[PDB]
Design a protein around this ligand. Structure first.
Ligand SMILES: C[C@@H]1O[C@@H](C[C@H]2C[C@@H](CO)O[C@@H](O)C2)[C@@H](O)[C@H](O)[C@@H]1O
Ligand SMILES: C[C@@H]1O[C@@H](C[C@H]2C[C@@H](CO)O[C@@H](O)C2)[C@@H](O)[C@H](O)[C@@H]1O
Ligand SMILES: C[C@@H]1O[C@@H](C[C@H]2C[C@@H](CO)O[C@@H](O)C2)[C@@H](O)[C@H](O)[C@@H]1O
Ligand SMILES: C[C@@H]1O[C@@H](C[C@H]2C[C@@H](CO)O[C@@H](O)C2)[C@@H](O)[C@H](O)[C@@H]1O
Ligand SMILES: C[C@@H]1O[C@@H](C[C@H]2C[C@@H](CO)O[C@@H](O)C2)[C@@H](O)[C@H](O)[C@@H]1O
Ligand SMILES: C[C@@H]1O[C@@H](C[C@H]2C[C@@H](CO)O[C@@H](O)C2)[C@@H](O)[C@H](O)[C@@H]1O
Ligand SMILES: C[C@@H]1O[C@@H](C[C@H]2C[C@@H](CO)O[C@@H](O)C2)[C@@H](O)[C@H](O)[C@@H]1O
Ligand SMILES: C[C@@H]1O[C@@H](C[C@H]2C[C@@H](CO)O[C@@H](O)C2)[C@@H](O)[C@H](O)[C@@H]1O
Ligand SMILES: C[C@@H]1O[C@@H](C[C@H]2C[C@@H](CO)O[C@@H](O)C2)[C@@H](O)[C@H](O)[C@@H]1O
Ligand SMILES: C[C@@H]1O[C@@H](C[C@H]2C[C@@H](CO)O[C@@H](O)C2)[C@@H](O)[C@H](O)[C@@H]1O
Ligand SMILES: C[C@@H]1O[C@@H](C[C@H]2C[C@@H](CO)O[C@@H](O)C2)[C@@H](O)[C@H](O)[C@@H]1O
Ligand SMILES: C[C@@H]1O[C@@H](C[C@H]2C[C@@H](CO)O[C@@H](O)C2)[C@@H](O)[C@H](O)[C@@H]1O
Ligand SMILES: [Cl-]
Lengths: 342, 344
């Protein structure tokens, strides 16, 4: 009935290459903050409200026309959304997509540009709904993929265009289910990848087109598992002792880099050395005192930026410099953890 | 007349390997691909996809990861061949009909439907598209009018609208765009002025602005750009100097710094690059040596390094890439390639 502490924001690279973060304020509204300019260390806009009243982490996704769209569980437990009405410009009103959900929503674009949203239902199964045409309503009917899940779901597209969803099962193993063809409503059966996981799964598509899943294990280390050929391996440990969900992102050269809170409440990281096919470093501290999981993203200068909530409940930020990382700086605001599953 | 063309079409496959496509002495399409997703990977060697082509062959990756090659045939129709699956074999060559007079230019709409553009016998711009994402059947051909004198170049805007560029009859750079993503409604043709003496090369910058590169009347490398993400007004033309004897090729370093490549007056490969960051000033031109007989083709590999291909004095495809501090010694991938560009 427990997962590692969640991320405090959802992040996206905008149509024009800037970082934009979304989180939940003390009023339960979705707020957001963005870089002025597409560069590491740009000034930030400060927090502005998109209003609403939410009961999940708000999750941003960029439509294939560049319009941001934010999905969140509402006060009636329906899936709600709000979208830019023109690329990188004004926002709509909040609208309901109905349903009854009991997790944070997870989103990906099909190969046809239709966004598809996945979330745990009132029956604890995985449900989904999608745009009927590319980056546009109306939306489909809600449909079930069955199963019984106990984490937030995570979706990613394979290198052949098939969506695949990952979630913790009732035996605490990592389970997954996939599209049998791109854009399809036909899916495989649920299948177990075994292991024990104690966080939401984090899924990345490698430079060589293989899905790779990261999760906290029963021993509180960071573990991972991967497809052996483009579109599985044994579970393998990357060690560490982590007190939050992990975050993973790709460097300029596609080397993966994993971030998580330590038992000292500092941010810690481990990275692939040499290349995207290389072995992982041992862990190193990036300091700070943080009160959420980190959120990691590559910016328009090819530099990793990491966000995490601080002891004052503001969002703080550190990034890669030529040969080190920048001192933690505050972006202000007061953010709450509204994750539907804690 | 246009500056000497690129000799190959290159792509980063869905599993992170570079794959190049060219025309052999037999007029067939040949290809060569990295075994591994890394700078300096060994190569397959040249093998034939057959066909007899009469344009540059142009590869594009469908949104399901399957490569698809487009080329003009001996009957002047558009022809194509595609992978049946991402790491499987190829279809037979199949005709999309029409009669075309340029190399094809391809881009995916926001709905995953490929759209192909080519000049017609009337010298207008024509187009045809997949009816559903990454799949046949295709639409009927239709015209976007105009009178064009180079190969066309297409790129998607950061708001999803396709936009096509081509030299006009006054030798200026002209363009035309979708009014909405996935749409069959387009703007009128509009001039961006200047004089161009190569095909246009079009990039979408890290900040979502289309930027076009072309050789000028003075044989320098020139460029012009949208000043606002997916929007006019455009800049005026600006020179990046140099004196170039081929079409330019442009690619993004992993940090998004643009880098332009072209054959020099000494027939070596030369380049100029943005300094500091993706909105910084360009360097002076510097030589990467070699003696080349086509325009270069530049592409960022799965290690985030630039790799540049060009035909050599023996008509083989040669290759140099970025290393930590410099560039690798030119190396040969063999083969014998011809310039089959439908417009020269
Ligand atoms: C995310 C938001 O954070 C603070 C406002 C921000 C508004 C902004 C105005 O410029 O200033 C920042 O420092 C504070 C709180 O008062 C809000 O209830 C909300 O939790
Ligand atoms: C995310 C949603 O948030 C509010 C929507 C209202 C937000 C308001 C902002 O002005 O607009 C009104 O039309 C809708 C709640 O009432 C809903 O139950 C839901 O939790
Ligand atoms: C995600 C998994 O979900 C159920 C199995 C699924 C197996 C499947 C058989 O193919 O049928 C579905 O309805 C039930 C549970 O019993 C497992 O412990 C796990 O939580
Ligand atoms: C993800 C990991 O899952 C189990 C080990 C796995 C090791 C693997 C062989 O390497 O076999 C699998 O069946 C079990 C747990 O004991 C670990 O603490 C961790 O939670
Ligand atoms: C994430 C880090 O992993 C290792 C531990 O020794 C550290 O203290 C921290 O928990
Ligand atoms: C994420 C932030 O972490 C610490 C400050 C950092 C300040 C920084 C100075 O640049 O030094 C680092 O070692 C510590 C806390 O005091 C803040 O409230 C916040 O929780
Ligand atoms: C691109 C092709 O290039 C050569 C064959 C290549 C075959 C390869 C071994 O299969 O060896 C390489 O060195 C040469 C020519 O003879 C063909 O007509 C065609 O122009
Ligand atoms: C690109 C095309 O290439 C050949 C046909 C292909 C037809 C196919 C039959 O399925 O076989 C392949 O080897 C050759 C020519 O005859 C066509 O006019 C066209 O130029
Ligand atoms: C690409 C351009 O194409 C024609 C004009 C187009 C302008 C437009 C009139 O508004 O109508 C279209 O059919 C014709 C030529 O006259 C120009 O020199 C140029 O080559
Ligand atoms: C792209 C360039 O086009 C013309 C000049 C442009 C320079 C620009 C400077 O302000 O103004 C525009 O109207 C014309 C030619 O003379 C150049 O050799 C080159 O072909
Ligand atoms: C692409 C290169 O372009 C010119 C030089 C550039 C060299 C640079 C450094 O002097 O200055 C710029 O104005 C001109 C020619 O001399 C080279 O042979 C080559 O064709
Ligand atoms: C692109 C290639 O260019 C030269 C070789 C390069 C070999 C290299 C030594 O590794 O030195 C450089 O200066 C020249 C020519 O001799 C080749 O036939 C070919 O056209
Ligand atoms: Cl790097």
């Amino acid at each position: 009935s427990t997962i590692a502490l969640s991320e405090i924001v959802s992040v996206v690279n905008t149509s024009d290459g800037r970082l934009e973060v979304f989180g939940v304020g003390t009023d339960k509204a979705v707020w957001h903050n963005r870089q002025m300019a597409p560069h590491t260390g740009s000034p930030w806009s400060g927090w502005s409200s998109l209003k609403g009243q939410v009961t999940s982490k708000p999750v941003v996704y960029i439509n294939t026309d560049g319009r941001l769209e934010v999905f969140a569980r509402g006060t009636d437990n329906a899936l709600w959304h709000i979208w830019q009405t023109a690329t990188n410009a004004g926002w709509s009103n909040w609208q309901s997509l109905g349903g009854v959900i009991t997790s944070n929503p997870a989103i990906y674009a099909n190969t046809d540009g239709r966004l598809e949203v996945f979330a745990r239902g009132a029956d604890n199964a995985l449900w989904h709904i999608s745009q009927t045409t590319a980056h546009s309503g109306p939306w489909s009917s809600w449909a079930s993929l069955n199963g019984v899940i106990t984490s937030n779901p995570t979706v990613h597209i394979n290198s052949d265009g098939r969506l695949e969803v990952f979630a913790r099962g009732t035996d605490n193993a990592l389970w997954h289910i996939w599209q049998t063809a791109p854009d399809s409503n036909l899916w495989s059966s649920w299948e177990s990848l075994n292991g024990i996981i104690t966080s939401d799964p984090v899924v990345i598509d490698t430079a060589d087109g293989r899905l790779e899943v990261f999760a906290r294990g029963a021993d509180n280390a960071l573990w991972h598992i991967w497809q052996t050929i483009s579109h599985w391996s044994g579970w393998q440990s990357l060690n560490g002792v982590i007190t939050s969900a992990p975050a993973v992102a790709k460097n300029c050269d596609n080397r993966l880099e994993a971030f998580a809170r330590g038992t000292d409440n500092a941010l810690w990281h481990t990275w692939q050395t040499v290349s995207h096919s290389g072995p992982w470093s041992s862990w190193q501290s990036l300091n700070g005192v943080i009160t959420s999981a980190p959120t990691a993203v590559r910016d328009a200068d090819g530099r990793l930026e990491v966000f995490a909530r601080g002891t004052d409940n503001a969002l703080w930020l550190t990034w890669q410099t030529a040969s080190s990382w920048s001192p933690w700086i505050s972006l202000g605001g007061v953010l709450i953890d509204a994750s539907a599953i804690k």
